[PDB]
Ligand code: HEM
């Protein structure tokens with residue numbers, strides 16, 4: 001289930017982080033805008049860049065901490081608040097997050113693997129709702 005999926009992702013965090021983020025950027029290419037140093041680079045080119053891997057790992061690390069502190073896929077209001085208040089997120093809406101979680105849920109379905117995709121779908125919805133509540137537009 002959802003706890004096991006956190007263990008699976010954490011187990012190979014850099015590979016899942018890159019694979020899922022790239023699925024996100026390729027599914028929603030206008031999102032590439034917020035990431036000026038990833039513009040005009042192939043998946044392969046990006047996976048060779050230390051800093052691409054480092055930033056995606058830090059994002060998915062924090063995402064896995066928020067997932068782990070959640071109860072029945074409902075995140076803490078304080079985790080939501082952390083995500084709205086970070087300077088790096090100051091020009092984002094809930095739609096940016098929605099799209100990430102649509103990409104994460106589609107990756108999992110398309111994976112060979114028994115991910116609890118419906119739980120990640122629900123976690124994404126709950127987090128987008130909590131982010132709104134904490135004042136993100
Ligand atoms: C659960 C979802 C997300 C989490 C946990 C998260 C977490 C983080 C973290 C930890 C950083 C700092 C990275 C570092 O210093 O290396 C960061 C930066 C950033 N995040 Fe997010 N983020 C999320 C979603 C998004 C989304 C959906 C967008 C845009 C569509 C976004 C845009 C950015 C940008 C532009 C930065 C700064 C530049 C960069 O580090 O690449 N984030 N985020």
Ligand SMILES: O=[N+]([O-])c1ccc(O)cc1
Pocket residue numbers: 021055056059100
């Ligand atoms: O998935 N994301 O939103 C990300 C991914 C990588 C990054 O450096 C910043 C944000």
